[PDB]
Design a protein around this ligand. Structure first.
Ligand SMILES: CNCCCN1c2ccccc2CCc2ccccc21
Ligand SMILES: [Cl-]
Length: 548
């Protein structure tokens, strides 16, 4: 049972709302198959080594994202930045779970609300295929999503977001209460019911794939998915999106992997865990893309439009597509209930760890918080609830789009780049390899050390620079955000990016001694500070810097 339970746990972690909700519309937005080449390249080159590095760091040091930097005191700013990014993500990651809960509540009927027009939310322009360069938006499913759930028709833009929708308000309250009561006792919440949260997503995906392959237009969708537009690979939008999606999907750069690995056994095999998680993530993402493109190829045929204009390119793509596919199944109410229960379970389980990252990271830094986990959990959860109330307004989709663009973009790329630089160069890739050997019994291969020191940092720096210099003003379908929205988004990104230099400055100023003494204290592990008075600093020799 040692292996079956391990396989089930890794498969449960490898599937989340990233693959099922975000990856579909990022793949649709970037043409289809042309998004997979950069995705796989980044996966290998940067994602797998960084996942391995974070797991090893957490396992060896037994600390969270903030306090793990006792080895290199100058990067506690990086730790704080990743904690802040994790805090930002929840604000809308929980709004997506609220959407799922609302859809589940709406699915308890013999006539699904998204099957035809004729409802109070339907507009005169609603067009039903059965009863008779834009994104269409006049289908029953799109009309339901945008008017009976979002009520987006009551907001003219991000300047007129309006008041929170009360139904989504109740759903968000329920989600927040469930999160709090699942996090208020401690980190130990696995191995009890996660079994059904690990197999249900794959059963749902398999049934969706099998049924959608045999649909009238699925062939065209599959052809578009497998076609590669090589001109799209010369624009850097696909590359930036692929890098951000890889780091979001795998979970690196948020302080979650380090926090959870801090509770591992000192001899746990992090290499095997990283390999299996990455492989399962890639396969699941590919299958999700296949199913999604089959569904929208079917829709292109049914609605008599081009496949590029069938659906939205935003965060509601799955909430449009999956209901459309469900409506084609036999006994569609049962399948809708099953699918939205699966979405609820996936989202709640993932958000649990997402918030645990923040809680553990800040409790390791302050013991007062560690002594009062209930109050601290309540505070974190309540703050998330309010800043998510900001995202369930009539124009809450605009705020959600801005957040999904800026909270973890260049910010997360920069944070992961700083993490890799810190470890590999300042702490020492040789020291890191020695720690991994002391833990798991073998030294990492040359490929892993090369990726940690040279390859991953180079690609991360390139992608950060390209994302900064090739920045497209924010949009949502046919809506263009005002420039101040772009300024606000870049400010949100900087709020996390800037913690690193600020903490470097603060650590330098708060230390006592001469300039060289301050540097030695700042780049020396906290448990070897007695060697600084001995003028024996490894980093002050070329051997440390040329070591691989
Ligand atoms: C790993 N896929 C993302 C799943 C959710 N995610 C969350 C959730 C809420 C807040 C932050 C984050 C950061 C990324 C991450 C990392 C590990 C588990 C979950 C999450
Ligand atoms: Cl993904």
């Amino acid at each position: 049972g040692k292996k079956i339970d391990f396989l089930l746990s890794v498969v449960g972690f490898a599937v989340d709302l990233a693959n099922v909700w975000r990856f579909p519309y990022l793949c649709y937005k970037n043409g289809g198959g042309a998004f997979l080449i950069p995705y796989t390249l980044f996966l290998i080159i940067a994602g797998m080594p960084l996942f391995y590095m974070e797991l090893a760091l957490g396992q060896y040091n037994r600390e969270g994202a903030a306090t793990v930097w006792k080895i290199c005191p100058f990067f506690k700013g990086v730790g704080y930045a990743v904690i802040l990014i994790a805090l930002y993500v929840g604000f809308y990651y929980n709004v997506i779970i609220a959407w799922s809960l609302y859809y589940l509540f709406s699915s308890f009927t013999l006539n699904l609300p998204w099957t035809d027009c004729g409802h109070t939310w339907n507009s005169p322009n609603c067009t039903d295929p059965k009863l008779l360069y834009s994104k269409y938006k006049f289908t029953p499913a799109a009309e339901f999503y945008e008017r009976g759930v979002l009520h987006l028709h009551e907001s003219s833009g991000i300047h007129d977001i309006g008041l929170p929708q009360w139904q989504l308000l109740l759903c968000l309250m329920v989600v927040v209460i469930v999160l709090y009561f699942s996090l208020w006792k401690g980190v130990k919440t696995s191995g009890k019911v996660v079994w059904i949260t690990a197999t249900l997503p794959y059963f749902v995906l398999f049934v969706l794939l099998v049924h959608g392959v045999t649909l009238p237009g699925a062939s065209n969708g599959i052809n578009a998915y497998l076609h590669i537009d090589f001109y799209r690979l010369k624009e850097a939008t696909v590359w930036i999106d692929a890098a951000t999606q890889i780091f979001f999907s795998l979970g690196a750069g948020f302080g979650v992997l380090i926090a959870f690995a801090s509770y591992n056994k000192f001899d746990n095999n992090c290499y095997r865990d990283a390999l299996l998680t990455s492989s399962i993530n890639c396969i699941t993402s590919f299958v999700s893309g296949f199913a999604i493109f089959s569904i929208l190829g079917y829709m292109a045929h049914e609605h008599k439009v081009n496949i590029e204009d069938v659906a939205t390119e935003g965060a509601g793509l799955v909430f449009i597509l999956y209901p459309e596919a469900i409506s084609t199944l036999s006994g569609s109410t049962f399948w809708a209930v099953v699918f939205f229960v699966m979405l609820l379970a996936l989202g709640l389980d993932s958000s649990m760890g997402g918030m645990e990252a923040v809680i553990t990271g800040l409790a390791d830094d302050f013991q007062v918080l560690k002594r009062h986990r209930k109050l601290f959990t309540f505070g974190v959860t309540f703050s998330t609830f309010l800043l998510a109330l900001f995202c369930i307004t009539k124009g809450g989709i605009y705020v959600l789009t801005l957040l999904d663009t800026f909270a973890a973009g260049t910010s997360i790329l920069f944070a992961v780049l700083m993490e890799a630089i810190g470890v590999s160069w300042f702490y020492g890739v040789d020291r890191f390899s020695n720690d991994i050997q002391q833990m798991m019994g073998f030294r990492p291969g040359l490929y892993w050390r090369l990726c940690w020191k040279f390859v991953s940092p180079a690609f991360l720096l390139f992608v950060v620079v390209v994302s900064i210099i090739n920045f497209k003003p924010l949009t949502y379908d046919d809506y263009i955000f005002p420039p101040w929205a772009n300024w606000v988004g870049w400010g949100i990104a900087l709020s996390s990016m800037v913690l690193v230099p600020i903490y470097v400055i603060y650590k330098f100023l708060s230390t006592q001694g001469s300039l060289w003494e301050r540097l030695a204290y700042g780049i020396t592990p906290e448990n070897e500070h007695h060697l600084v008075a001995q003028r024996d600093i490894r980093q002050f020799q070329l051997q440390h810097w040329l070591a691989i």
